[PDB]
């Protein structure tokens, strides 16, 4: 027989057919999946008086455990099953309620924002309800559902109850972001946006996906602070870091201006760097669990040798700041001292009038001032061979993976900002963001400027042609722009940044799949032109939308600080050496655009930035950002058992894919990054990769490391993010 405990409390015979029926519905359309296999594996685990919820997790996980490259469709059989369990868990049945009914329930329960009911009428809800296709929950992969369940759907912290499905998330994120539009266009926008996201064309960051609809207003997750050379400013920088990390934000600190050990910060940078680290980790489980930062400094800082080794797992404690990453800032002069095998002179910023500023803003003025200050006896300084410092940096970058490079001249010669007014003098946690900053001198100092960015990405895998990107750019740029007026500003300097420039950073996911589906490869140059054509489409249509929005609503108050304001487009300023690696003609009318921007302005001083991705690219089953996958199958560790995600369309494309460690070397990838940088407003989270078993005696030569460091400078690459070294 075998009895079954229900949700109420009484038994009743087990309904083996009801199961096989749900199981049947679920394999709808999928190929290569055995239903009997799933029953034979779950049913053996069923015990007399087992409860309903258990039967249901048992059959999900059994579907789940069958995911392999050979039978990838299980990915979906397990999802649909989980999707089903989650409907019953939320609404007690399959059909979700009417959206208006649902919203009122959620508001009274205090889990949705009441603003939703003041902003839309029941008839407007009844109409939104018609846009919803609840059948789209059927298209998530299983690794997707696991992420929804854990990070996205509105739920219970404590009891663990789940209150909404995915289509209710998408529709309400849409309602909220587009709620202030006028009646003529609003619900058209809500529909057209809802569609873009629920079909995986536009991807949103976690705090947006998790919080837009609920009473919260915290969504800034990406802050950039610059610290001045005074106690007040360090106190201000620290306090600001504190505020922002309490709200789960990654931070880019520029502490380069701090004066060196034993200057007339008398006790030097390191003790102040430590103080930043504790600010950063002020809101973390044991002192490692959330809160993250990258700190920046110029390569010529007097204490650089001592800063290069801060996260080194050897050494003594008063010389170690290990729970932060660093970006070393380099320009053409340094690299020239490297090629010519001469020295680099270190100076403390406090002793060299306008060297620091010329570093970022005017490379000639730097030349003049550097050689000038080198010659002057009265100035405290320090010489070291340039082969030495570069090796030290590279030896550290290799050892930890996380000593990063900013090429600060590229950031200012090829940028949306004019460096005489608003220079880019740092990046953020992941090296994709590049924005101007002003140091504060109190937390609430109004003359300060901390930089924020609001992020997103197109799914290159989901669009059927480049011109599909027009609508998507419009949707993306409008949503994130509404978001800016919507979210909270804990620090006045941070509002000034966001209100004054309204900067955005929209990237891509699914580059690798995209490359495969057009039968190209990272490593050999076969993809240069496709990549050039693609990022043209991208930048162009992102500007076009921001231009159109600037007409309808006003360009951004500090638009006149940009190059764009003067008629200078990225296509005028890209590193000229790219000319030698691609010949793809421009396809779109950039002069029409030149004039239209110059006249009407832009809503957003920046629009593009290539960021890393993991959560987001799981939800759509897409390759991560622009990176080649390590393998065909991803493994995540989870209380619910092993999570597997097979790269999109494996069965047809396993020989199309170029996997990470199958690339002969870094050269094609960097050519591809550099081609993106021709059109991207900010930077790219660009990796370097080294397989030790490709090198004599299993050891990576300092020669290849530097030769690659220069390949990237030459092709105009602004930043280098992680180094990955494979084991064996």
């Amino acid at each position: 027989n075998l009895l079954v405990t229900k949700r109420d409390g009484s038994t009743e015979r087990i309904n083996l057919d009801k199961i096989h029926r749900v199981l049947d519905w679920a394999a709808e359309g999928l190929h290569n999946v055995s239903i009997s296999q799933v029953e034979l594996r779950s049913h053996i685990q069923f015990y007399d008086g087992i409860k309903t919820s258990d039967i249901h997790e048992t059959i999900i996980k059994a579907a789940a455990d069958l995911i392999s490259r050979d039978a990838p469709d299980y990915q979906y059989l397990a999802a649909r099953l989980a999707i089903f369990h989650l409907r019953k868990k939320a609404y007690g049945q399959f059909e979700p309620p009417a959206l208006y009914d649902h919203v009122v329930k959620m508001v009274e329960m205090g889990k949705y924002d009441n603003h939703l009911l003041e902003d839309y009428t029941e008839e407007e809800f009844k109409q939104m309800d018609t846009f919803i296709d609840h059948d789209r929950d059927m298209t998530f992969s299983y690794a997707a559902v696991k992420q929804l369940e854990g990070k996205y759907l509105v739920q219970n912290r404590v009891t663990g109850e789940i209150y909404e499905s995915a289509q209710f998330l998408y529709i309400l994120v849409a309602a909220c972001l587009f709620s202030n539009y006028p009646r003529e266009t609003r619900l058209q926008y809500v529909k057209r946006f809802y569609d873009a996201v629920s079909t995986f064309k536009i991807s949103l960051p976690t705090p947006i996906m998790s919080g837009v609809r609920t009473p919260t207003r915290q969504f800034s997750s990406c802050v950039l602070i610059e610290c001045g050379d005074s106690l007040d400013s360090i106190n201000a920088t620290s306090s600001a870091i504190v505020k922002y990390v309490s709200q789960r934000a990654g931070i880019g600190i520029n502490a380069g201006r701090i004066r060196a050990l034993g200057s007339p910060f008398h006790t030097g940078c390191i003790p102040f760097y430590k103080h930043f680290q504790t600010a950063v980790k002020s809101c973390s489980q044991g002192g490692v669990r959330g809160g993250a930062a990258t700190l920046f400094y110029p390569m010529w800082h007097l204490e650089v040798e001592s800063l290069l080794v801060l996260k080194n797992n050897r050494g003594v404690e008063g010389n170690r700041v290990r729970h932060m990453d660093y970006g070393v800032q380099i320009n053409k002069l340094m690299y020239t001292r490297l090629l010519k095998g001469e020295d680099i002179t270190l100076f403390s910023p406090s002793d060299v009038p306008g060297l620091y500023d010329a570093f970022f803003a005017d490379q000639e003025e730097f030349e003049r001032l550097y050689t000038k200050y080198e010659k002057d006896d009265s100035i405290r300084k320090q010489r070291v061979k340039a082969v030495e410092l570069f090796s030290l940096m590279m030896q550290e970058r290799a050892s930890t993976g996380r000593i990063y490079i900013q090429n600060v001249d590229h950031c200012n010669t090829h940028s949306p900002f004019d460096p005489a007014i608003a220079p880019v003098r740092q990046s953020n946690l992941c090296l994709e963001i590049a924005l101007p900053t002003k140091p504060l001198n109190d937390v609430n100092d109004e003359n300060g400027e901390i930089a924020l960015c609001t992020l997103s990405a197109f799914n290159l895998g989901a669009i059927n042609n480049l011109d599909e990107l027009e609508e998507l750019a419009i949707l993306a740029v409008r949503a994130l722009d509404a978001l800016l007026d919507y979210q909270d500003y804990p620090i006045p300097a941070a509002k000034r940044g966001a209100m004054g420039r309204r900067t955005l950073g929209i990237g891509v996911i699914n580059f690798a799949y995209y490359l495969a589906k057009h039968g190209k490869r990272y490593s050999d140059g076969s993809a240069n032109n496709l990549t050039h054509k693609t990022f043209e489409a991208i930048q162009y249509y992102l500007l076009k939308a921001s231009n159109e929005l600037a007409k309808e609503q006003g360009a951004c108050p500090w638009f006149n600080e940009t190059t764009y304001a003067k008629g200078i487009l990225p296509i005028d300023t890209y590193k000229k050496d790219l000319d030698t690696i691609a010949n793809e003609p421009l396809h779109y009318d950039w002069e029409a655009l030149r004039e239209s921007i110059k006249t009407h302005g832009l809503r957003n001083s920046t629009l593009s930035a290539l960021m890393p991705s993991e959560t987001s690219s799981q939800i759509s089953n897409a390759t991560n950002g622009i990176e080649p996958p390590r393998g065909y199958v991803s493994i995540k560790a989870s209380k619910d058992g092993i999570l597997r995600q097979v790269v999109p369309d494996y069965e047809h494309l396993h020989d199309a894919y170029e996997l990470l460690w199958e690339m002969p070397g870094n050269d094609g990838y960097l050519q591809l990054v550099g081609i993106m940088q021709k059109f991207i407003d900010q930077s790219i989270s660009a990796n370097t990769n080294y397989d030790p078993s490709r090198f004599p005696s299993g050891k990576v030569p300092m020669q290849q490391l530097l030769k690659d460091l220069l390949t990237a400078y030459k092709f105009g690459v602004k930043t280098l993010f992680y180094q990955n070294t494979r084991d064996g």
Binding site: L338, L339, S391, M394, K699, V700, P701, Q703, L710
Partner: peptide, 16 residues
């Protein structure tokens, strides 16, 4: 790990 040796005359041939 990493092979300390660096050739400057190799390098001097790179154009930035």
């Amino acid at each position: 790990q990493i092979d300390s040796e660096v050739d400057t005359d190799d390098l001097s041939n790179f154009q930035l």
